[PDB]
Design a protein around this ligand. Structure first.
Ligand SMILES: *[C@@H]1O[C@H](CO)[C@@H](O)[C@H](O)[C@H]1NC(C)=O
Ligand SMILES: O=C1O[C@H]([C@@H](O)CO)C(O)=C1O
Length: 246
């Protein structure tokens, strides 16, 4: 399991948590020195438990699929909550089995469905460590509209930061003040699968991408990523989605 405590959190301790989250995910190989997540994992071992505590020290446990860093659901006190999707249904066979009841959220976990539920695109939802405190607090007691927003914050501050050092850094800058995510953040989030695939295909193409990946950079400019010498690959991305799962 991994844990994170908002009380006393600072950029350094958040960065530590994110490192621990990345290190909790298994891989047998690296591709251009980036850990390649497994194609598949059998049974219960497929799910990592991330214990999160708000500033007041109340906690939720979040279940994360170690093959794709997707959040399946979470436990708040004696009640479990899972997305309305086959993968999370499965997860519910293995995790939080002693919850007194299980709620299926009225939406799947994809960004587009969460945004609709939350009533706003994530461009307009501030993120940061205080937003994460708020999100944990929201999730402690069921409210599906509010939870959609809290889940968007939760996903981006945990899984997306684990995937991209740049997003980790964004959150670090938002340690004590939330701000909407930069376009670059959105762009990386949206491109993780595509980036992951091209990086894997580049191996056999001398580090060159079969299809270039268009992103938004730190300056708010469009950039075209063609090969593994880009900073996106050498410095930013930290985990690759197996092409088996694309
Ligand atoms: C690879 O990427 C670098 C960094 O963007 C760029 O300057 C260079 O032209 C590209 N090289 C090839 C072989 O495509
Ligand atoms: O395809 C997606 O996977 C994650 C989701 O599973 C939650 O982690 C996400 O946000 C998407 O849009």
């Amino acid at each position: 399991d991994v844990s994170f405590r908002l009380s006393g959190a600072d950029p350094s301790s958040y960065g530590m948590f994110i490192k621990d989250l990345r290190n909790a995910l298994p891989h047998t190989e690296k591709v251009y020195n980036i850990p390649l997540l497994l194609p598949s994992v059998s049974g219960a071992g497929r799910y990592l438990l991330m214990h999160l505590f708000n500033y007041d020290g109340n906690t939720i446990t979040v279940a994360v699929d170690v093959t794709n860093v997707y959040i399946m659901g979470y436990l708040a006190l004696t009640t479990s909550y899972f997305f309305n999707e086959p993968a999370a249904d499965l997860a519910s066979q293995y995790v939080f089995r002693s919850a007194r009841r299980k709620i299926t959220l009225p939406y799947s976990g994809n960004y587009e469905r969460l945004q609709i539920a939350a009533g706003k695109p994530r461009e307009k939802i501030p993120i940061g460590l205080p937003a994460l405190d708020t999100a944990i607090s929201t999730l402690l007691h069921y409210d599906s509209t509010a939870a959609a927003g809290a889940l968007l914050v939760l996903i981006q501050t945990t899984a997306e930061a684990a995937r991209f050092k740049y997003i980790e850094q964004q959150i670090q800058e938002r340690a004590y003040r939330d701000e909407v995510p930069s376009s670059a953040t959105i762009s990386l989030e949206n491109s993780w699968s595509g980036l992951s695939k091209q990086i894997q295909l580049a191996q056999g193409n001398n580090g060159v991408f079969r299809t270039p990946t268009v992103l938004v950079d730190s300056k708010g400019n469009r950039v075209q990523i063609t090969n593994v010498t880009s900073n996106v690959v050498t410095s930013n991305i930290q985990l690759l989605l197996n092409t088996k799962n694309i």
